[PDB]
């Protein structure tokens, strides 16, 4: 972990240092905040309550945020992280590198569900 | 086994009322460990039965709840244990964590350094502390229990309730005595960590006056006694059912009240769990700037 969350100390765009180490076979970030929850939730990205489905895990948010766990300024424009404080919802397949799905996802806006991963609006 | 599906063990009065000399602990599954589902660490375990047994006690949970969380980081620089409250309290409750290092996590405020350095502007509803220093004789330990117990006596509503981890060699004369000062306490031992002489000392209701006369030194010599005395197989069976796992959104009303007008009614509410007395400003927490 010390690895990879150096690594994007060393780079002006984080978020593709990270992407670019895990597809070159790089381990992902552990430790991610993973809870245990009645898979009877919502199955939005993220909440203020875990909402995890059954084919779904829910994460700490602070804890699968790039820029929280390598204590690098966050990029949105208000500087406050949109997971710290909040629950995130993972793809069960996807739990192998939940710090590389937040990076590589957005939540729909006219609908709270992962585009790809549950947002049904087209 | 019903015990397997409680979330732990309580202390019971059976043996808070013994009279012993302090013993080595002796735990019959010691250097055993629970295993925990794939990448879920056991502190979420430990601080969900502990979240699980505070639900049976008669905890006061206001709109805008004050917790402080004392010992929320890890080495893994990660704080699973404030998840989990995150996780439990209510959506609008704050939650402030701290620990002497560095590390991420879900509460509205995070403050690093040693716990002394957290300045308490007003008084809190919860607290929660995992500290532990793991640097002959088994005596009280000072550490951050002097802190701990200062605050008790001023910075803890009426009403308010705390969860204080201890172990066997990680203890104090002082925080057993305060608990006298509540309307019910116990120590509480999780399943998830059963082999361990980890407890939670629990005071639930503070009233800022002696309920019950407690001699510290004897009530530790009390707890390990039990410990000894006392079968816990490691288990997280209790973690099986989470439908009902959240905190109950009591809507306990907050007043201000002098010391003169503290009346038997005002007691009995307290030690309910149905009564929080304190100021209702906004909270402020910071760190001072010590020595
Ligand atoms: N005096 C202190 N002030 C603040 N934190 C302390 C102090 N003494 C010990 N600690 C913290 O006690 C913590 C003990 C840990 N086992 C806590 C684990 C953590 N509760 C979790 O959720 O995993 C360590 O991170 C210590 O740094
Ligand atoms: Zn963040
Ligand atoms: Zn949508």
Known sequence: ?122 | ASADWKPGHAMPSLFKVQNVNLERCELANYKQSIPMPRGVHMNIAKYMQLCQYLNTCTLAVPANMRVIHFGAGSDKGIAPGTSVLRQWLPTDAIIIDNDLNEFVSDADITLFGDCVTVRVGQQVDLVISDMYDPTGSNESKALFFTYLCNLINNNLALGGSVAIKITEHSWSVELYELMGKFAWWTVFCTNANASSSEGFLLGINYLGTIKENIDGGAMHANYIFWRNSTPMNLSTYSLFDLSKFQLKLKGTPVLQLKESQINELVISLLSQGKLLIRDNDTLSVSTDVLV
């Not at chain 1, 992902?28 to 084919?55: Q, R, Y």
Request: hydrophobic share 30%; with cysteine.
């Open chain 1, 1 to 122: 972990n010390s690895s990879v969350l150096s690594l994007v100390n060393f780079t002006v765009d984080p978020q593709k240092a990270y992407l670019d180490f895990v597809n070159a076979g790089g381990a992902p970030l552990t430790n991610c905040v993973k809870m245990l929850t009645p898979k009877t939730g919502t199955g939005i990205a993220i909440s203020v309550k875990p909402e995890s489905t059954a084919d779904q895990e829910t994460y700490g948010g602070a804890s699968v945020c790039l820029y929280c766990r390598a204590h690098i300024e966050h990029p949105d424009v208000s500087g406050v992280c949109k997971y710290k404080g909040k629950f995130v919802q993972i793809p069960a397949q996807c739990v192998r590198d939940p710090v590389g799905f937040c990076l590589s996802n957005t939540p729909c806006n006219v609908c709270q569900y992962w585009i790809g991963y549950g947002c049904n609006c087209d």
